[PDB]
């Protein structure tokens, strides 16, 4: 698995070379599908290795949801040094995997035939995607996971082909997805940055390191935050704000080149506050008008070597029309500190580069590549990416 484009140059992609994506080398100047919509689709599931079988995970079954939670908790994404692993909660998984239009057949699991143990997974959810001058119904792919005991046995390509087949059956022929590794071919490359909120604990568990010329006392002083936000009229999003949050987001996203196109029901799903999942705060000014909003989702991580999870908040969508973005994000940091998060994470996409350094974010070691499947278009800079996944 290559982490840079230079490593990716010196690699062959036996699977991705067979897929309708552009080659890593080529520079793209056209806009459109690689292959046609299919007017007949394979009715039979793809063949798994002997002793494994497909299943569709009904997450409304609490027992099945726990099986998926356990698979990811033990086998999903780790940092580059194998010190931390994502710990998506069951309630978070329901939020990410049952948005409007979700389908249980798009919760595609692999089980051991004899024991029924869940050992693999991949998911699709529907999304309307604006890419340059085109709006396309697509799916978002997430949670590709193969049990550590089943790795390097070609199961991931089978998972990808099977979810492709199941999405094709519903008449959808494009997808968007992200990955920490380089594959053919990123439409955009983003980088995570990190804002320490509880620096003591972050240095303790080695998420971050003391600047070595700086002491712990100076570090805690450097990163300290106010006790309450400063923006006038800031309050949690409520039901009555759903239309204006939808209207604010739609107009704000027009300036980027890769964005979601959300219905009002989708806006309610992705933004209405749910404790320990998603937080949204709106600014309601002295006229009663909602003019801005900030949002972040909750994604803790297991500390693998030694304890409490590393509690992280991830910047979601932040829309400003009256409050300066720098002020809005200062208040996001203070609210995250108030809620007990240890670190606040943000990518360098959209306008985030305008505040990351000023608000004392430090650059991370992980890139996040964005990809489209069966859509060949020019690549874009991180500041034109306007899409945030979970």
């Amino acid at each position: 698995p290559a982490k840079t484009m230079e490593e990716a140059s010196k690699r062959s992609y036996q699977f991705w070379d067979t897929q309708p994506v552009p080659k890593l080398g080529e520079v793209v100047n056209t806009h459109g599908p690689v292959e046609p919509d299919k007017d007949n689709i394979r009715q039979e599931p793809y063949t798994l290795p002997q002793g494994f079988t497909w299943d569709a995970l009904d997450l409304g079954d609490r027992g099945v949801l726990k099986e998926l939670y356990t698979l990811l908790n033990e086998n999903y994404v780790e940092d580059d040094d194998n010190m931390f692993r994502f710990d998506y909660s069951p309630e978070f998984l329901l939020w990410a995997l049952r948005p409007p239009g979700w389908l249980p057949q798009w919760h595609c699991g692999v089980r051991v035939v004899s024991s029924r143990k869940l050992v693999g997974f991949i998911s699709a959810i529907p999304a309307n995607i604006h890419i340059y001058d085109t709006e396309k119904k697509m799916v978002e792919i997430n949670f590709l996971c193969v049990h550590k005991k089943l790795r390097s046995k070609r199961v991931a390509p089978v998972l990808i082909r099977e979810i492709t087949r199941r999405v094709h059956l519903e008449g959808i022929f494009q997808a968007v997805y992200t990955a920490g590794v380089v594959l053919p071919k990123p439409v955009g490359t983003c980088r995570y940055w990190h804002r320490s909120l509880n620096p003591r604990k972050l240095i303790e568990v080695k998420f971050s390191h003391l600047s070595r010329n700086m002491t712990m006392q100076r570090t805690m002083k450097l990163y300290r935050l106010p006790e309450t936000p400063k923006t006038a009229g800031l309050r949690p999003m409520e039901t009555k704000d759903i239309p204006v949050v939808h209207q604010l987001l739609t107009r704000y996203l027009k300036q980027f080149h890769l964005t979601p196109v959300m219905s009002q029901e989708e806006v309610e799903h992705w933004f209405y506050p749910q404790e320990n999942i998603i937080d949204t705060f709106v600014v309601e000014n002295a006229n009663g008008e909602v003019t801005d909003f900030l949002s972040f989702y909750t994604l803790p991580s297991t500390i693998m070597n030694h304890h409490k999870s590393l509690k992280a908040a991830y910047s979601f969508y932040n829309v400003h029309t009256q409050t300066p973005l720098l002020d809005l994000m200062s208040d996001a940091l203070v609210l995250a500190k108030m809620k007990g998060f240890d670190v606040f994470n943000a990518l360098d996409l959209m306008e985030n580069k305008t505040f990351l350094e000023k608000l004392k974010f430090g650059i991370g070691d992980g890139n996040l590549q964005y990809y489209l499947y069966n859509w060949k278009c020019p690549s874009m800079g991180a500041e034109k990416v306007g899409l945030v996944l979970q």
Binding site: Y76, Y177, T178, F207, N345, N367
Partner: peptide, 8 residues
């Protein structure tokens, strides 16, 4: 899937 990143 998401990427796990930490302080460089």
């Amino acid at each position: 899937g998401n990427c796990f990143s930490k302080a460089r």
